[PDB]
Design a protein around this ligand. Structure first.
Ligand SMILES: *[C@@H]1O[C@H](CO)[C@@H](O[C@@H]2O[C@H](CO)[C@@H](O[C@H]3O[C@H](CO)[C@@H](O)[C@H](O)[C@@H]3O)[C@H](O)[C@H]2NC(C)=O)[C@H](O)[C@H]1NC(C)=O
Ligand SMILES: *[C@@H]1O[C@H](CO)[C@@H](O[C@@H]2O[C@H](CO)[C@@H](O[C@H]3O[C@H](CO)[C@@H](O)[C@H](O)[C@@H]3O)[C@H](O)[C@H]2NC(C)=O)[C@H](O)[C@H]1NC(C)=O
Ligand SMILES: *[C@@H]1O[C@H](CO)[C@@H](O[C@@H]2O[C@H](CO)[C@@H](O[C@H]3O[C@H](CO)[C@@H](O)[C@H](O)[C@@H]3O)[C@H](O)[C@H]2NC(C)=O)[C@H](O)[C@H]1NC(C)=O
Ligand SMILES: *[C@@H]1O[C@H](CO[C@@H]2O[C@@H](C)[C@@H](O)[C@@H](O)[C@@H]2O)[C@@H](O[C@@H]2O[C@H](CO)[C@@H](O)[C@H](O)[C@H]2NC(C)=O)[C@H](O)[C@H]1NC(C)=O
Ligand SMILES: *[C@@H]1O[C@H](CO)[C@@H](O[C@@H]2O[C@H](CO)[C@@H](O)[C@H](O)[C@H]2NC(C)=O)[C@H](O)[C@H]1NC(C)=O
Ligand SMILES: *[C@@H]1O[C@H](CO)[C@@H](O[C@@H]2O[C@H](CO)[C@@H](O)[C@H](O)[C@H]2NC(C)=O)[C@H](O)[C@H]1NC(C)=O
Ligand SMILES: CC(=O)N[C@@H]1[C@@H](O)[C@H](O)[C@@H](CO)O[C@H]1O
Ligand SMILES: *[C@@H]1O[C@H](CO)[C@@H](O)[C@H](O)[C@H]1NC(C)=O
Ligand SMILES: *[C@@H]1O[C@H](CO)[C@@H](O)[C@H](O)[C@H]1NC(C)=O
Ligand SMILES: *[C@@H]1O[C@H](CO)[C@@H](O)[C@H](O)[C@H]1NC(C)=O
Lengths: 313, 240, 40, 47
């Protein structure tokens, strides 16, 4: 859904504390700003992406204190109030499973993971108590077995098939939510698509910092070493090499980050589309909410992402 | 329905007249392309470490074999200023494409059809949509049914009648606390629980939360209304 | 009497749903809404 | 017919409603039985 908001003081990256270097960087005009603008554009778009996915309710529904959902046991996907962070049992597995001088900084998201969990709690409590109806308008309560019967009727299976099997359908559902804990407890690899985004952003920043150690044909890559060892009219030729290589190292990073931000955007638009059509509705779009005929889906927060638990016949 | 629709098209004019902010997503694109060109033109004034940014100032002042070294600085920086512009504009063009493909999808699924895809055509259940042109863009006026005045009711999954269990064909069983009715899921229109509004399956032992109430049958009066006529016939045919 | 305030944002109004194993809400009435969606 | 259609409310409110019959398939299935019933009563005038 998002990636780490990264801002660079370009002037500290290219000419870290050297005022004479900064006077040379002004000979390149707007490029010192154009790249801060581009990185700010990416950083704002992460809050946009996170609100298009999670802020699909302007109202915060809560689950009732009594848990008579006709035998369906949501306890692993609803909040645990006993924790400091109000996250569901499955959301804690997800949160566990995803793991200076150079001018780089990481800005916080507008929504902390506690607010993403509060939106996800509202989406899920809306879904459990009111079916699709909170998607359309005001939330209309309905008993959860009558909601499941409307679901069954949506996949073209007559609603008597729910009520005549309701303990079996609840035991199959409870068993399947059981296996979601077992998968998300056992393997490391299940969260691969979120860890891959975290890894790519860390690898691009590792590259960006490593290019500060490159010489670009100057007699040293240390900026203060060049200015210590040479007088101004000679030093300016060595520094123009460092400025040129550094600035190209930033344009490479910002281009890669814009192209990668367009992919996280495309994923956030898909995630927001699935929040709309899978959580706030029942989808007749084949394979859009996992294999099988779609019954309903439950959203879960993950670090920089969303997990959907799709339920299918 | 027509007065609510006509009133809502009235609010669209008021909204699009009153605030400047309504076209914010279109104005933001015109602003980005203006800002990227302002930047591309501003870089013509930059030295790139030549003695001047004015190209004719270099060529007036210096002879060929020296001027080549100054001009090469300006060529190098300018060419990088275009590669920066064209990369930014290609990345932007991909975003405008993604929006045009969405707009073309909404033209096809919201205007040329009716959408079952929740929240794809604004909040509510989609009725229809009207396209309107905007500079560099499209406005869709999505028309939607929103359920407005909810009231609570008691409800049950089935009616138990003659030990046969009955379920709604369309809609849900509801009660005002004295009588039971069948009604459609998104508009309160109660009806007598008939054998035409319901369907039977199995017996009443299995269904959790089933309720005892009568199920009507229109054949019952339409044949008892011949019973008493038939009985009158027989009683009168004792008179000869 | 004006100033710039700073605050933790509300995600929305809170609204517990009146759920029960046998309660349903049904709309007695509707509103036809018309909403503008704008696309580049 | 009463099978191809459904009833709700009365004819004052619907803008552009039209007058025509709706057929009932139970009407022949009961009145073919009424002419039969009438014959059985009329034969019972013979004893
Ligand atoms: C639940 O819905 C029921 C059906 O709409 C409703 O029953 C109906 O109630 C009205 C009175 O409110 C009765 O109207 C009769 O009132 C007297 C009867 O003595 C007469 O003066 C009138 O001419 C008229 O016949 C309906 O007859 C009655 N229907 C039935 C089948 O009993 C309940 O009152 C509703 N209950 C609640 C709590 O809303
Ligand atoms: C819904 O209506 C049903 C019919 O009125 C009713 O079922 C009846 O329940 C009683 C109580 O158990 C039974 O009475 C018999 O109880 C035992 C055997 O179970 C005998 O020792 C007694 O002498 C007596 O015969 C009725 O036989 C039974 N009737 C039927 C047709 O099942 C339900 O209880 C009603 N439920 C509600 C919630 O109203
Ligand atoms: C559709 O068929 C309807 C039934 O034939 C018909 O309604 C009838 O309209 C006439 C004309 O008004 C009524 O005649 C009475 O009008 C008033 C009293 O209402 C008196 O001044 C008259 O002397 C006369 O009694 C009928 O009573 C009325 N019938 C019913 C059941 O409403 C419609 O007009 C027809 N419409 C079309 C377009 O064909
Ligand atoms: C439909 O009913 C719910 C709750 O049931 C009622 O609870 C009592 C207050 C009493 O009226 C009983 O006869 C009913 O069974 C309503 O929920 C309440 O809503 C108000 C705000 O309108 C709120 O202050 C209460 O705390 C809510 N109570 C509970 C238990 O949730 C709901 O508003 C009713 N809907 C309509 C449209 O009337
Ligand atoms: C819903 O499912 C949970 C998870 O299986 C159930 O909680 C477990 O209950 C057993 C028996 O008391 C305990 O040994 C486990 O330690 C519990 N696990 C957790 C995470 O609490 C819960 O009982 C079920 N709810 C209902 C109403 O049946
Ligand atoms: C459904 O809601 C509409 C409003 O959108 C109600 O219409 C109003 O009704 C009152 C009388 O109750 C009139 O004074 C208003 O002039 C009506 N407004 C409009 C726009 O027509 C309507 O009454 C409601 N219907 C029900 C059955 O509750
Ligand atoms: C025309 C007619 O109805 N005829 C019947 C006759 O066939 C039958 O054998 C007899 C016995 O009741 O009753 C009379
Ligand atoms: C609903 O819940 C109550 C306890 O809160 C219980 O007594 C009752 O039997 C339940 N009814 C149904 C239809 O499940
Ligand atoms: C009884 O039958 C005779 C002829 O069979 C008829 O004239 C009379 O109207 C009938 N009366 C009733 C009350 O059915
Ligand atoms: C249709 O329009 C004509 C006038 O063009 C009018 O006379 C007629 O009553 C209208 N019919 C309906 C069903 O609205």
């Amino acid at each position: 859904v998002s990636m780490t908001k990264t801002s660079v003081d370009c002037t500290m990256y290219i000419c870290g504390d050297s005022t004479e270097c900064s006077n040379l960087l002004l000979q390149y005009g707007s490029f010192c700003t154009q790249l801060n603008r581009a990185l700010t554009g990416i950083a704002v778009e992460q809050d946009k992406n996170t609100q298009e996915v999670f802020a699909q309710v302007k109202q915060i529904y809560k689950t009732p204190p009594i848990k008579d959902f006709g035998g369906f046991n949501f306890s692993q996907i609803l909040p645990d109030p006993s924790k400091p962070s109000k996250r569901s049992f499955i959301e804690d597995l997800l949160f566990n499973k995803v793991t200076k001088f150079n001018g780089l900084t990481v800005l916080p998201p507008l929504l902390t993971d506690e607010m993403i969990a509060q939106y996800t709690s509202a989406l899920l409590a809306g879904t459990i108590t009111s079916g699709w109806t909170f998607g359309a308008g005001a939330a209309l309560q309905i008993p959860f077995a009558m909601q499941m019967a409307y679901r069954f009727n949506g996949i073209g299976v007559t609603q008597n098939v729910l009520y005549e099997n309701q303990k079996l359908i609840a035991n199959q559902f409870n068993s399947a939510i059981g296996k979601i804990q077992d998968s998300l407890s056992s393997t490391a690899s299940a969260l691969g698509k979120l860890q891959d985004v975290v890894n790519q952003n860390a690898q691009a920043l590792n590259t960006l910092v490593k290019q500060l150690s490159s010489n670009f044909g100057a007699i040293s890559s240390v900026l203060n070493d060049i200015l210590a060892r040479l007088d101004k009219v000679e030093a300016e030729v060595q520094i123009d090499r460092l400025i040129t290589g550094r600035l190209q190292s930033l344009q490479t990073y910002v281009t890669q980050q814009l192209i990668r931000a367009a992919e996280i955007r495309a994923s956030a638009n898909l995630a927001a589309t699935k929040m709309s059509e899978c959580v706030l509705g029942q989808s007749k779009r084949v394979d859009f909410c996992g294999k099988g005929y779609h019954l309903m889906s439950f959203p879960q927060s993950a670090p920089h992402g969303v997990v959907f638990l799709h339920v299918t016949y | 329905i027509a007065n609510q629709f006509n009133s809502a098209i009235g609010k669209i004019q008021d909204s699009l007249s009153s605030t400047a902010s309504a076209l914010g997503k279109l104005q933001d694109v015109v602003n980005q392309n203006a800002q990227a060109l302002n930047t591309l033109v501003k870089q013509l004034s930059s030295n790139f470490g030549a003695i001047s940014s004015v190209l004719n100032d270099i060529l007036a002042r210096l002879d060929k074999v020296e001027a080549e070294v100054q001009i090469d600085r300006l060529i190098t920086g300018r060419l990088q200023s275009l590669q920066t512009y064209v990369t930014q504009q290609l990345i932007r063009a991909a975003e405008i494409r993604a929006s045009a493909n969405l707009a073309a999808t909404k033209m096809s699924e919201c205007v040329l059809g009716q959408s079952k895809r929740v929240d794809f055509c604004g909040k509510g259940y989609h009725l229809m949509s009207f396209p309107q042109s905007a500079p560099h863009g499209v406005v869709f006026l999505h028309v939607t049914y929103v359920p407005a005045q909810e009231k609570n009711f008691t409800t049950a999954p089935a009616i138990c009648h003659d030990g046969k269990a009955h379920f709604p064909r369309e809609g849900v069983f509801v009660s005002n606390g004295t009588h039971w009715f069948v009604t459609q899921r998104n508009f309160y229109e109660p009806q007598i629980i008939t054998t035409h509004n319901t369907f039977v399956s199995g017996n009443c032992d299995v269904v959790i939360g089933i309720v005892n109430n009568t199920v009507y049958d229109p054949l019952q009066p339409e044949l008892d209304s011949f019973k008493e006529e038939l009985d009158k016939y027989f009683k009168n045919h004792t008179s000869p | 009497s004006q100033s710039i305030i700073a605050y933790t944002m509300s995600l929305g109004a809170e609204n517990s749903v009146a759920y029960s194993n046998n309660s349903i809400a049904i709309p007695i009435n509707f509103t036809i809404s018309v909403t503008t969606e704008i696309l580049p």
